[PDB]
Amino acid sequence: PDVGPKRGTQVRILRPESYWFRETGKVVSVDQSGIRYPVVVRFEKVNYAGVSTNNYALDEVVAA
Amino acid sequence: KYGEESRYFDLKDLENTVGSWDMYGQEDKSRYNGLQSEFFERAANGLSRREYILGLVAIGGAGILAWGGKGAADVRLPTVGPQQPAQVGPRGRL
Amino acid sequence: MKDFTTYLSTAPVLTLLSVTVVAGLLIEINRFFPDALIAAF
Amino acid sequence: MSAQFLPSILVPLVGLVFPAVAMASMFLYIEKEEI
Amino acid sequence: MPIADYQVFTALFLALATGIFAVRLGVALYK
Amino acid sequence: SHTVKIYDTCIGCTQCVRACPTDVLEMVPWDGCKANQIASAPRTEDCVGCKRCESACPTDFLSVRVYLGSETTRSMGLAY
Amino acid sequence: DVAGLTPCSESKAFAKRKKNEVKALNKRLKNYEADSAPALALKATIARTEARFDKYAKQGLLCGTDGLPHLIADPGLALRYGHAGDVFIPTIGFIYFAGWLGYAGSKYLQAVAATAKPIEKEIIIDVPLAWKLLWEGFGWPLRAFAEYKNGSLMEDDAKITVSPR
Amino acid sequence: AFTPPTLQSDTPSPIFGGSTGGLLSQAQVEEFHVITWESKKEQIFEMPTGGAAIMRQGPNLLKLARKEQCLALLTQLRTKFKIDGYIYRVFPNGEVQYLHPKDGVYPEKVNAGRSGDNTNMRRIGQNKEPVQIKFSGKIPAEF
Amino acid sequence: KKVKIVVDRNPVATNFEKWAKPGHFSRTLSKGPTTTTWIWNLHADAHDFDTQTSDLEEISRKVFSAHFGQLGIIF
Ligand code: CLA
Ligand code: CLA
Numbered sequence: 001p002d003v004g005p006k007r008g009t010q011v012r013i014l015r016p017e018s019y020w021f022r023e024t025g026k027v028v029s030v031d032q033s034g035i036r037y038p039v040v041v042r043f044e045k046v047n048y049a050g051v052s053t054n055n056y057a058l059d060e061v062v063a064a
Numbered sequence: 065k066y067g068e069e070s071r072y073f074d075l076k077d078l079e080n081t082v083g084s085w086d087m088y089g090q091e092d093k094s095r096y097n098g099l100q101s102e103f104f105e106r107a108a109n110g111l112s113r114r115e116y117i118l119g120l121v122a123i124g125g126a127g128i129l130a131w132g133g134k135g136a137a138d139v140r141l142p143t144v145g146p147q148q149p150a151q152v153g154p155r156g157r158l
Numbered sequence: 159m160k161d162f163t164t165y166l167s168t169a170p171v172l173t174l175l176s177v178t179v180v181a182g183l184l185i186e187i188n189r190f191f192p193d194a195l196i197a198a199f
Numbered sequence: 200m201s202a203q204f205l206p207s208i209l210v211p212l213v214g215l216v217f218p219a220v221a222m223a224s225m226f227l228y229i230e231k232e233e234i
Numbered sequence: 235m236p237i238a239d240y241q242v243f244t245a246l247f248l249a250l251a252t253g254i255f256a257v258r259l260g261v262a263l264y265k
Numbered sequence: 266s267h268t269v270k271i272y273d274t275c276i277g278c279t280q281c282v283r284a285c286p287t288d289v290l291e292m293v294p295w296d297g298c299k300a301n302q303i304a305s306a307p308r309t310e311d312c313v314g315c316k317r318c319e320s321a322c323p324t325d326f327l328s329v330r331v332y333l334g335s336e337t338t339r340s341m342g343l344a345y
Numbered sequence: 346d347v348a349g350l351t352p353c354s355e356s357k358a359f360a361k362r363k364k365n366e367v368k369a370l371n372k373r374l375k376n377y378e379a380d381s382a383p384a385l386a387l388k389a390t391i392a393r394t395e396a397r398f399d400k401y402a403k404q405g406l407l408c409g410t411d412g413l414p415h416l417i418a419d420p421g422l423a424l425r426y427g428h429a430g431d432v433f434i435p436t437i438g439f440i441y442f443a444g445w446l447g448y449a450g451s452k453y454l455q456a457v458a459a460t461a462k463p464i465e466k467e468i469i470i471d472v473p474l475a476w477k478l479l480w481e482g483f484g485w486p487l488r489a490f491a492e493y494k495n496g497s498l499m500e501d502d503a504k505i506t507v508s509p510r
Numbered sequence: 511a512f513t514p515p516t517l518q519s520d521t522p523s524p525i526f527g528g529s530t531g532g533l534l535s536q537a538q539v540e541e542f543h544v545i546t547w548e549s550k551k552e553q554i555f556e557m558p559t560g561g562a563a564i565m566r567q568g569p570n571l572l573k574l575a576r577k578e579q580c581l582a583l584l585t586q587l588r589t590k591f592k593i594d595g596y597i598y599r600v601f602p603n604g605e606v607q608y609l610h611p612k613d614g615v616y617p618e619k620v621n622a623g624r625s626g627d628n629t630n631m632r633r634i635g636q637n638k639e640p641v642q643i644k645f646s647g648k649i650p651a652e653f
Numbered sequence: 654k655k656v657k658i659v660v661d662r663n664p665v666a667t668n669f670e671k672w673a674k675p676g677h678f679s680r681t682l683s684k685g686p687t688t689t690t691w692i693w694n695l696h697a698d699a700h701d702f703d704t705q706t707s708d709l710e711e712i713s714r715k716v717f718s719a720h721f722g723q724l725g726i727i728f
């Protein structure tokens with residue numbers, strides 16, 4: 001069916017690179033194609049560049 | 065450059081399109097008198113080599129040492145002159 | 159009236175009013191109880 | 200001090216001759232194209 | 235008994251030899 | 266001559282290419298992002314190091330990185 | 346006497362200092378009338394100076410060789426020699442008021458953090474809520490201890506962002 | 511089907527009174543750049559070296575020092591007059607090398623047929639540790 | 654042509670609606686104070702009328718009123 005968490009699900013970032021490491025965000029959409037980072041996650045905490053959305057892989061996010 | 069109009073670029077004359085001009089240079093071999101020119105080129109005969117011209121500069125270095133060991137004393141420099149009395153200091157020192 | 163009270167609730171207005179109130183209270187404490195070097199109870 | 204003439208020769212040598220020689224040599228060496 | 239002129243000359247010569255050893259070490263370090 | 270690198274985190278927004286003042290980056294076909302394009306630095310010899318490309322990258326962390334290295338007459342922006 | 350200090354009551358330097366200050370004030374007062382404004386102001390200053398010196402000597406403060414009061418900042422040493430009001434009691438008073446303000450701010454921040462638009466609540470403070478939380482902050486020691494023993498006063502280290510080492 | 515367009519030396523230059531911010535002695539011993547564009551009308555534009563010039567109606571050629579100056583002028587032409595230009599690099603010996611529109615297509619547009627030079631297939635934090643490449647004239651980004 | 658007194662009637666309404674909305678003059682200060690930089694930007698561009706609007710008439714009117722306010726402060 002669909003890979004990754006469903007849209008609107010709280011997830012925790014596992015990428016130490018990310019400004020939101022260990023922080024929770026909302027899954028906006030998940031691409032259903034052979035994409036390296038298909039999980040789109042929106043945050044309420046803007047980063048140093050003023051961005052509040054990012055792309056992560058299926059193994060870089062944890063539900064709840 | 066072929067600047068006959070508004071063209072300031074020319075691959076066949078790239079030398080003129082980069083501003084490579086003498087501006088003030090002028091070739092002319094008729095000026096210095098032959099008798100005076102010979103005297104100077106003769107005086108500076110072998111002094112045209114790096115080692116030989118540096119030797120002339122080495123003479124200046126010897127003059128510097130000569131001044132310290134003789135020239136400074138002949139001009140009555142204060143450092144090479146004598147000293148008069150002295151002081152004691154703040155407390156009972158010297 | 160609501161907008162005026164909202165403006166009075168802004169960070170700069172509230173900061174200046176709070177600092178003024180604290181400074182006034184301290185000034186009056188020192189005016190009535192001056193030279194309080196130690197806590198003599 | 201013994202040999203009062205020594206400072207009058209060593210001071211200019213270390214402050215005038217040696218620095219000029221060292222600077223000239225360093226300048227000629229740091230721009231050699233092939234050392 | 236202040237040091238004589240010959241002592242200063244000997245010290246300067248020994249310093250010259252030491253400087254030669256130092257320049258040799260510097261050349262070896264450059265290589 | 267600086268070192269410019271592009272990572273798979275790129276989303277092919279082409280902002281870094283438009284922000285380059287010396288034409289060092291370009292977009293080439295790819296298949297790792299929805300845009301189906303990746304950034305590349307074929308002319309790193311003309312890179313000056315302004316890091317304008319990094320200021321335009323929206324990915325976190327940056328998908329394009331510039332490492333300043335040996336300075337040349339072009340990387341130093343010298344006109345004389 | 347604690348560390349070679351003499352009580353200000355029996356300190357000769359303390360009395361000399363008071364005498365000199367009053368003398369300077371009277372010297373300045375001599376150049377005015379008896380009921381003029383500057384004369385009244387100088388007399389008030391003289392009275393305040395005398396009251397201050399008398400209070401310092403009566404409060405039991407310790408004076409050094411220079412004749413100025415010295416404070417004892419050490420529990421036990423200040424408690425057994427009657428100097429707890431120098432640093433001990435002021436320490437308790439500060440800690441209490443500082444914790445009150447800090448707890449009120451913490452509660453306000455946590456309460457507005459749950460709102461849909463917290464940044465606006467931070468730049469545009471909610472006066473009624475801030476007033477209520479400021480009043481509630483007076484019981485900050487009890488609340489803080491309860492939250493600590495409850496485990497809700499801390500955030501899990503695994504939930505706080507950290508640098509990539 | 512694209513080939514680098516040759517540089518025509520018969521292209522007139524824009525009307526300019528001259529300035530002190532032009533080419534220096536570097537262009538005579540190192541290199542310089544040339545930007546050629548086509549304008550539909552004679553209009554005033556700002557030069558990267560200071561001042562204002564007037565581009566003629568037709569082909570225009572301008573020689574500058576650095577490539578950044580040519581690219582800045584091209585950006586001004588594209589965002590102000592909607593004019594496309596070509597940049598070339600000229601050496602003192604007489605060699606002309608095409609530049610910016612390398613494959614006729616602007617770099618911001620994918621052309622499918624370019625070189626994917628300098629494109630790592632890892633993340634920024636997946637590079638080798640600096641201690642693992644010690645005593646090697648390379649940075650962790652080149653592995 | 655012909656120097657005369659040309660004026661526009663009631664261009665701006667007098668109320669406190671914008672007083673409760675800091676950063677209303679700037680378009681870039683509309684996303685709210687996400688970071689503390691917004692607070693500094695609010696004061697660094699308060700009098701930069703050239704950025705708040707692209708119309709020279711509004712800028713001139715703002716300058717005139719600011720001059721009147723400055724005169725009142727000096728008084
Ligand atoms: C590092 C130690 C040291 C230092 C800081 C100095 C400093 C000084 N010396 Mg001296 N000297 C030294 C060692 C030192 N000396 C030793 C070991 C000897 C025994 C041979 C002497 C014998 C000596 C004499 C006879 C005289 C001085 C004099 C002087 C003064 C003028 C310098 C000069 O022109 O003389 C030249 C100094 C020399 C020819 C010998 C010094 C050689 C030293 C060891 C070189 C050390 C280099 C250092 C380790 C490397 C640093 C790198 C640097 C070169 C960039 C000056 C204050 C003159 C003076 O008294 O002034 C009034 C003087 O006439 N020195
Ligand atoms: C809710 C307010 C609040 C609280 C609870 C804390 C709590 C803390 N702060 Mg912090 N701080 C604050 C505000 C606050 N801060 C503000 C506004 C600033 C900007 C000036 C800072 C700047 C700051 C720095 C640089 C540091 C701390 C540090 C710390 C920690 C050690 C205690 C300390 O040193 O405090 C120090 C307090 C200050 C330096 C300034 C306090 C600012 C005011 C006085 C308090 C806030 C008033 C608040 C707005 C009242 C609102 C009332 C409400 C009803 C609306 C501690 C957990 C230190 C730390 O990390 O320790 C490990 C540290 O390095 N703080």
Ligand code: CLA
Nearest residue numbers: 693694695696697698699700701702703704716719720723
């Ligand atoms: C008639 C005089 C005048 C006027 C009308 C202006 C008007 C303007 N200036 Mg300008 N300027 C002036 C004089 C003037 N300036 C002078 C004399 C200088 C030399 C210092 C400058 C240097 C200057 C610079 C560098 C800049 C401007 C800018 C601007 C524009 C935005 C101003 C703004 O909103 O920033 C905000 C205003 C403030 C934040 C006010 C802060 C006041 C200062 C920082 C505090 C000083 C302390 C004060 C002396 C009291 C000390 C006590 C304290 C302890 C409480 C604006 C159109 C800016 C611009 O972008 O232009 C478009 C710009 O960057 N001005």
Ligand SMILES: CCCCCCCCCCCCCCCC(=O)OC[C@H](CO[C@@H]1O[C@H](CS(=O)(=O)O)[C@@H](O)[C@H](O)[C@H]1O)OC(=O)CCCCCCCCCCCCCCC
Nearest residue numbers: 121122124125216219220221223224227228233234253254
């Ligand atoms: C009022 C007037 C005052 C007058 C003062 C005196 C003026 C005299 C002027 C003379 C200028 C100096 C001589 C010429 C310069 C020269 O050849 O450069 C020398 C070479 C030139 O480079 C290059 O080095 C090359 C070697 S390679 O390329 O590295 O192989 C080689 O081709 C050649 O050496 C050279 O081209 O440069 C060097 O390598 C020198 C580097 C170090 C210089 C300081 C040495 C340390 C102090 C000296 C030792 C003290 C005593 C030790 C024992 C106690």
Ligand SMILES: CC1=C(/C=C/C(C)=C/C=C/C(C)=C/C=C/C=C(C)/C=C/C=C(C)/C=C/C2=C(C)C(=O)CCC2(C)C)C(C)(C)CCC1
Nearest residue numbers: 246247248249250251252253254255256257259260261263
């Ligand atoms: C014979 C003799 C005479 C000549 C005397 C002469 C001519 C004397 C000259 C003495 C001198 C000139 C002594 C110089 C000594 C210099 C020394 C001791 C320098 C030591 C430097 C050291 C130890 C460190 C070097 C360093 C190292 C090693 C590095 O690797 C980096 C650089 C640096 C840090 C500097 C005359 C005719 C008068 C009379 C007749 C007899």
Ligand code: SF4
Nearest residue numbers: 285312313315316318
């Ligand atoms: S650092 Fe500057 S010149 Fe280099 S690639 Fe990035 S934007 Fe282009």
Ligand code: SF4
Nearest residue numbers: 275276278279281322
């Ligand atoms: S700016 Fe970043 S995301 Fe956009 S094309 Fe360049 S490298 Fe890719």
